[PDB]
Amino acid sequence: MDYILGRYVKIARYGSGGLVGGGGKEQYVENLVLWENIIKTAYCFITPSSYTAALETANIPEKDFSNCFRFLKENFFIIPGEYNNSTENNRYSRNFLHYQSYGANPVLVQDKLKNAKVVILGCGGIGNHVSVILATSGIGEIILIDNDQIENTNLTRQVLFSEDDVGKNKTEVIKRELLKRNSEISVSEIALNINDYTDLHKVPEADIWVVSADHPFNLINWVNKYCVRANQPYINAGYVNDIAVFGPLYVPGKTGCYECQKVVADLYGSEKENIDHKIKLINSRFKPATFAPVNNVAAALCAADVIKFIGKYSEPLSLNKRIGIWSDEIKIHSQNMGRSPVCSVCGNRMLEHHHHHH
Amino acid sequence: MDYILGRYVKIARYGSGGLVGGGGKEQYVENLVLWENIIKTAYCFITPSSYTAALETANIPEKDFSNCFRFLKENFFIIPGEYNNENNRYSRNFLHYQSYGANPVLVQDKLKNAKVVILGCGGIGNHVSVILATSGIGEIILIDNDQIENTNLTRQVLFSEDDVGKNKTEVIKRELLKRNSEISVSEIALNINDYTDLHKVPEADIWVVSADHPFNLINWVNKYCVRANQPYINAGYVNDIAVFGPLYVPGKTGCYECQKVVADKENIDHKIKLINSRFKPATFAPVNNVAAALCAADVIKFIGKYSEPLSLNKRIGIWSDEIKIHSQNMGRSPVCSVCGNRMLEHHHHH
Amino acid sequence: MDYILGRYVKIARYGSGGLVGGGGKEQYVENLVLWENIIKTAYCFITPSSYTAALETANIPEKDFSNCFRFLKENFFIIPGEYNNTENNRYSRNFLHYQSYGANPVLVQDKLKNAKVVILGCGGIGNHVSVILATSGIGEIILIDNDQIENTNLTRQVLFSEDDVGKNKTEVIKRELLKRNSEISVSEIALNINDYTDLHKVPEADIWVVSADHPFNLINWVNKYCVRANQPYINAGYVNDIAVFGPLYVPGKTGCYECQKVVADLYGSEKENIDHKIKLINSRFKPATFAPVNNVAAALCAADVIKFIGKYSEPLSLNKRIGIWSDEIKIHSQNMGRSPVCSVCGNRMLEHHHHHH
Amino acid sequence: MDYILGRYVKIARYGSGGLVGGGGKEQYVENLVLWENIIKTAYCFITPSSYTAALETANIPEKDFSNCFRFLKENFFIIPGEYNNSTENRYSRNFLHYQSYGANPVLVQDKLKNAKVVILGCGGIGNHVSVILATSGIGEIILIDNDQIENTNLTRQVLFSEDDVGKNKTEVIKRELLKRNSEISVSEIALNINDYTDLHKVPEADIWVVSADHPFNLINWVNKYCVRANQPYINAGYVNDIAVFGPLYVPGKTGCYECQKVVADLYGSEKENIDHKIKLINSRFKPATFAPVNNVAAALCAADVIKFIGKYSEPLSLNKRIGIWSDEIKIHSQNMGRSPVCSVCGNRMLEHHHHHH
Ligand SMILES: [Zn+2]
Ligand SMILES: [Zn+2]
Ligand SMILES: [Zn+2]
Ligand SMILES: [Zn+2]
């Protein structure tokens, strides 16, 4: 078993020891003498070589070599030599170092993406944008579900549309634009909007559903019930005026669902009739105050989670979480949506006080 | 003067009272009576009305009305009637500007009459330009001298397979024109290899500085911009971490240098150099997008003058394998060699 | 009317645009297009040219050309061709300096040549001022001192050889000025000013340089005299550590040395026992002077004289007494502008007659 | 250890307290009780006297005498009696100045006689500096230049006669400095610095006076070389009518010319048709100079060299480039204090904090 140093590993002196690696997977080491030894070990693995062959060129004592090795190995600073097979720039090279640095065989990862089916449930700004990122990263099959046509005002949000495209169907244009970007992938269309809960029966099985159509406000409740019942993984994305929302990513039997922690606000009108008519009116007039850069942020983090989910190389960020990114301040909130045994949508079980008999 | 209720205000009964608002501006009103009173007053304005006419129409004592009115005005829930007037493609943004208390017509104008330079059309700048083009920025200037590689197709969301071989600059111009034929775009076949290259880059409302090579590009842009009085914004990544560096504005925010610090076996020192010499960034497409988008957001805010850019005095990092957004200080330093007063005056009368 | 570009004009790309000029008169032009336009037009004038011919030659529209021309003219970056025409001129470095101030160097030289300066006290500062003036072509100097060169003076008085200890200050500096400039005429007057009346011996001159470090109130007599004689003068000296120059007095135009003086309530001291002790300590006073200070004062004082006679820019000394520190970097200015109620140059003086016509 | 009152101390009633000192070393004391006490005790020291011997003569609280003593001592109003042995001297004028700054005047002169100073470039500034340094007692002077005296030099370089045109500058300066002080030695080196590498030929000295004005970038060279060769220097010159002097670079203990910013280098245009224009305009350039400015830079420069060598006071141009305006009362200093990160004399890089999490 030959190991090799990742081309993404950086080193610098800092604190009472040093830093190994860069970005998310960066490690900080206390003992300056250990830090030296890690550098020493790392050097030996610059060329793909077995544990014994690398050791044979080290100066440090065999014992410390075993420590550094395990360290560098577990952190993914040195990786199996196989994980390095080149190919002719392979289009997805700029993504291979990323997978390596998380400890995955980049070839396994791409194969999974190539073999995945992903449904875009709703093709406004967000689904639009997720599908590009997914196509562009090698998702094999994409199913575009929508029934609207490209309007005038859509051109601010939906980064794929020309002035030339007003009037045409959303899925039509997204479909041609994804084919321009990657002709090795297959894409289908379904002329459908979820107007009633039962419409969901018409949506096909896939590895995951991307669920982002801001209307109806309660689409997620539907999608959640349906997906729990139908054993179907989904991830949700959207916005609330100027906050970008994404998550949960729901995985049947392995995570919580949208109702588990009964997190988000219940909607009510008024008990007094004369003020309820006023509320009904005000809410009928409602249009969201959106901002395209927020659109984009939710969409990209969302697409990121899908890639991890199907590529099986890292824990997606939005397991058990609804996540809000603020745009008028540096602020990220996370709502807990971990599995609840007592959820009224998934799991069969009730919540009770102890009854002490004596 | 007429006021009108913004179309972006929602209401819901909640807890001891209820909600008025929606997004980053939602408000819980705990006192039921006051909430009801707010609805009662908000209702006068679905249809434009002066303050005094609305006081007539509502049937609550002037004492209470006056609070509810200030509450509505102060949060921009009601806004001047003028701010509402068409068949306009930017009209979804208009609500956003309204909700910030601006006048959407003036914000569009400011964007129309602005000029933005993208310095580095590789990925982040790529993406930033689209967002800016589609929000109605009047003129973009594209500054790259590289060719579209096959391998760039992963990060640079504007390009077809067809496009490999062609000039980065040139493709994105036809795309921005397809998306917005009203705006004008220019190309400058230039990469920045010496400090001196920046003299070729024109004067603009702001500069977007994305490109990853050379490692000390910001340094020159900074030096240049401090003495050129040129506002600029930095953006980029560090492996899987998206970064949108400080937005610098002439003698208001302090520069990329202000917060810098003095800083820190020659057999191991030889090895660290070598290893680092071999560095290739482990980079992740959805990251470019996050940084590009927040960077583009600060630009619209900067030109639109409707709320504070997040980037003032701060370098922001968004993680991707973790939910984490850290902010780093880049506020002004008095003793800073680049933007600090190096002069002293020794003269005086009586 | 030919204009021409001054040889003291420099250009550099800087910042949003660039610099034009260099020195006291340097300018930063923030708009690149206008800077570019300024040099495009400056280029027409390297060889002499009318405004008209330069307009044709430059290929920028009339509107822009007109600004650039004015910009170049206003700052004397371009100057009348007449101011330039050599054959082989000794003063031609200064000529650039005058040009840069907007003057006609020939007229400035003339005014210098046809002037006459009295150095009233040829001990160090005066010593130095005279060389500087002789060197710039002041046509006639009159040296006024009755002292002998002592060995100790060699520290402050730059013109003197060890050889010269013994001879008359006046006499040496006269030969030294002729060595430097055989063009000019120089006169001596073996005279120290010992009481007011001595000043009647000092001749009329375009200006008087008043340096002598004693008697303490020499300035006062010179003031009295010059106010009533209509004689312009400039004071110069030191206070230990500190070089001092000005005011430069101009009859009618400026303040006199008296104008800003004040009643001084704290006369000496209260307690008689200590008052005579302060007097005793001060009686023993000897100034701690520093040679380079002599030079600073003398030089600025000489500069004001050349400007006064040359009429090309304002002397700094007008209405001001200036002090330059030496153990600290620091320049202080003190007010000496006109006072209406001043004994020396104010009125007597009232008229009580009128005719109803 | 006997103490004596400096012969340069003056006293006056002023404000709430009084003044003790006169000159840059002048002190303002507020409590009039303390003031009179200071004068009381000063009187006691007019005669060279030990602390206790002076005390007997004093009619004030023994504790109060101790404060005044410490005041007058720290400020150099009283000085050790040893500091008064001189001769019947030539440098006696300078001696009170050194006393008043708290140095043994004799220590200081010895250092001056034992110093070697290089004048790198003998234009107007170098010229004038050498005279001042010579007449102040600098033991050895090394004049480096390869020019001949021209016609037009006589306006600036206050040592040259009309009979000297044609001769080498160092030749004439050397004769003129020997007339002024034959107790000193002077060498010549026929050398102009045309390339950076010519600096290897300049001898080692206590300090270099670097005053030559061509090329504009002499100082850059001299700075690099001096940093590398461990060589103190001080720089002086002019920008048209502004007189510049400083930094004085001291190897261990000071900033260098590049420790901060100025100019960053000329830039021309990035458009070719405009670069050719600026290229031509700049080739025609001659400075607009004013001799009185020369003198100011030269004098303050010499002053700093005297302090540096005599180790008696802080030179003014440490960590500073100083501009003295001549068309107005204006002095600016640019900060050139030491940078750890300087790319000429620093061993360290500038980094942002990296926060792990
Ligand atoms: Zn559940
Ligand atoms: Zn700064
Ligand atoms: Zn008067
Ligand atoms: Zn330095």
CA quadruple B210, B212, B213, B219: dihedral, nearest 10: 60
User: CB contact, 8 Å: A279 with chain B?
Assistant: yes
Buried b (16+ CB within 10 A) or exposed e, D46-73: bebbeeeebbeebeeeeebbeebbebbb
Q: Are D208 and D222 in contact (CB under 8 A)?
A: yes
Please answer yes or no on whether A89 and B6 come within 8 Å at the CB atom. no
Q: By CA distance, what is B336's nearest residue in D?
A: D260
CA dist., res. B38 & res. B65, Å (int): 8
Query: Which helix or strand (DSSP H or E) is residue A67 part of?
Result: helix A62-74
The total of other beta-carbon atoms located within 10 Å of residue B335's CB is 9
The residues whose Cβ lies within 5 A of ligand 3, an ion, are C 256, 258-259, 342, 344-345
User: Chain D: nearest CA to A240, how far in angstroms?
Assistant: 29
How many degrees, rounded to 5, is the angle at CA A14 between CA A8 and CA A16? Answer: 130
Record: contact D299-C296, CB cut-off 8 A: yes
CA distances from C299 to B231, C69, C210, C329, D203 (A): 46, 36, 14, 17, 32
A314 neighbors B321 (Cβ within 8 angstroms): yes
CB atoms within 10 A of CB D160: 23
Q: Which fold has domain B1-88?
A: Outer Surface Protein A; domain 3 (3.90.930)
D249, two tokens? 């670079």
CA angle D114, D120, D121 (to 5 degrees): 135
Around C76, how many Cα atoms within 13 Å sit in the side-chain half-sphere?
A: 19
Q: Identify any residues that bridge with A249 across adjacent strands, giving them in sequence order.
A: A235, A319
- CATH entry 3.40.50.720 includes domain B89-350: yes
CATH topology (fold) of C90-357:
Rossmann fold (3.40.50)
Structure tokens at B176: 């921005």
Query: D327 at the B interface (CB within 8 A)?
Result: no
Looking at domain C1-89, its CATH class is alpha beta
From 3.40.50.300, 1.10.760.10, 3.40.50.720, 3.20.20.80, which CATH number describes the A91-358 domain?
3.40.50.720
CB contact B178 to A (< 8 Å): yes
Instruction: With residue A121 as reference, give the H or E element that holds it.
Output: strand A117-121
Q: DSSP label at C204?
A: P
Q: How far is the CA of A333 from the centre of ligand 4 (A)?
A: 48
Cβ <8 Å between B196 and D267: yes
**For chain A, what is the radius of gyration of the CA atoms?**
25
Residue D209, C-beta contacts closer than 8 angstroms, at least 6 positions apart: D117, D118, D119, D120, D126, D129, D130, D233, D234, D236, D301, D305
- Helix ranges restricted to H, chain B: 32-44, 51-57, 62-74, 91-99, 104-112, 124-135, 168-179, 217-228, 266-277, 285-304
- Residue in B173, B143, B113 with CA at minimum distance from that of residue B303: B113
In whole angstroms, give the CA distance from residue A92 to residue A113.
Answer: 11
Beta sheet of C27-29, edge-to-edge order: C11-14, C17-20, C27-29
Residues D348, B196: C-beta atoms closer than 8 Å: no
Residue from D275, D329, D335 to probe the interface with B (highest B Cβ count within 10 Å): D335
User: Rg (Cα) of chain D, in Å, rounded?
Assistant: 25
CA triple A133-A137-A140, angle to 5 deg: 105
CATH class entry, domain A1-90: alpha beta
DSSP H or E run through B188: strand B184-188
- Which residue does chain B place closest to C329, by CA atoms? B346
Q: Which residue of D has its CA nearest to C270?
A: D13
Rg for chain B, CA atoms, rounded: 25
Contact C96, D288 (CB under 8 A): yes
Tokens, residue D231 = 């060589």
Contacts of D332 in chain B (CB under 8 A): 343-346
DSSP letter for each residue of C5-22: E-TT--EEEETTEEEES-
- List, in sequence order, the alpha helices (H) in A230-344: 273-284, 292-311
Q: Are A133 and A303 in contact (CB under 8 A)?
A: yes
Using alpha carbons, list the distances in angstroms from residue D206 to B161, D102, D127, D222, D233. Answer: 71, 22, 19, 15, 8
End-to-end CA distance of chain D: 65
C272 interaction partners in chain D (CB closer than 8 Å): none
User: Structural domain boundaries of chain B?
Assistant: 1-88, 89-350
Dump the DSSP string for D16-34.
Answer: SSEEE--STT-EEE--HHH
From the CA of B180, how many Å to the nearest CA of chain D?
A: 32
Burial class (CB in 10 A: 0-12, 13-18, 19+), B159: buried
Q: Does A163 touch chain B (CB under 8 A)?
A: yes
Measured between its terminal Cα atoms, the distance across chain C in Å is: 53
The one-letter amino acid at A88: E
Query: Is there a common fold for D1-89 and D90-357?
Result: no
Name residue C342's beta-bridge partners. none
- Ligand 4 centre to CA of D338 (Å) is 6
- The identity of residue C277, as a single letter, is K
Instruction: Report whether B156 contacts B267 (CB < 8 A).
Output: no
CA A200 to chain centre: 23
One-letter amino acid of C280: L
Residue A249, classed as helix, strand or coil, is strand
Instruction: Give the list of residues 6+ apart from residue C246 with CB closer than 8 angstroms, or none.
Output: C234, C235, C236, C301, C304, C315, C316, C317, C318, C320, C321, C322, C336
Cα three-residue angle C291-C292-C297, rounded to 5 degrees: 105
Query: Coil, strand, or helix at residue A285?
Result: coil
User: In angstroms, what separates the C-alpha of B199 from chain A's closest C-alpha?
Assistant: 31
Distance separating alpha carbons of residues A69 and A63, to the nearest angstrom = 10
Q: What chain D residue is nearest to A13 in terms of C-alpha separation?
A: D354
Cα–Cα distance for residue pair C94/C109, rounded to 1 Å? 9
As to burial, measured by CB atoms within 10 angstroms (0-12 exposed, 13-18 middle, 19+ buried), residue D230 is exposed
The experimental technique behind this entry is: X-ray
Q: Are B281 and B239 in contact (CB under 8 A)?
A: yes
Q: Which of residues 212-241 of B touch C (CB under 8 A)?
A: 227-230
In chain D, whose CA is at the least distance from the CA of A18? D356
Under 8 Å between Cβ of D316 and D300:
yes
Residues 6+ apart with CB under 8 A from B271: A39, A40, A42, A43
C-beta neighbour count of B220 within 10 angstroms: 17
* Alpha carbon of C348: minimum distance to chain D alpha carbons (Å): 33
Q: What is the largest CA-CA distance in chain D?
A: 87
Angle at C26 between CA C25 and CA C32, to 5 degrees: 140
CA A130 / ligand 1 centre spacing (Å): 26
Closest CA to A226 of A262, A202, A255: A202
DSSP string for residues in C65-92: HHHHHHHHHHTTSEEEGGGT---S-TTH
β-bridge mates for residue B20, sequence order = B11, B27
CB A69 within 8 A of CB A51: yes
CB of D121 closer than 8 Å to CB of D145: yes
What is the C-alpha separation between D309 and D114, in angstroms, rounded? 9
Element (H, E) at C350: none
Phi and psi, residue B117, nearest 5°: -105, 130
Helices A292-311 & A106-114 angle (0-180, nearest 10) = 110
C76: left (phi over 0), alpha (psi -120 to 50) or beta: left
- DSSP-derived letter for residue D229 is T
Query: Amino acid identity of B180?
Result: N
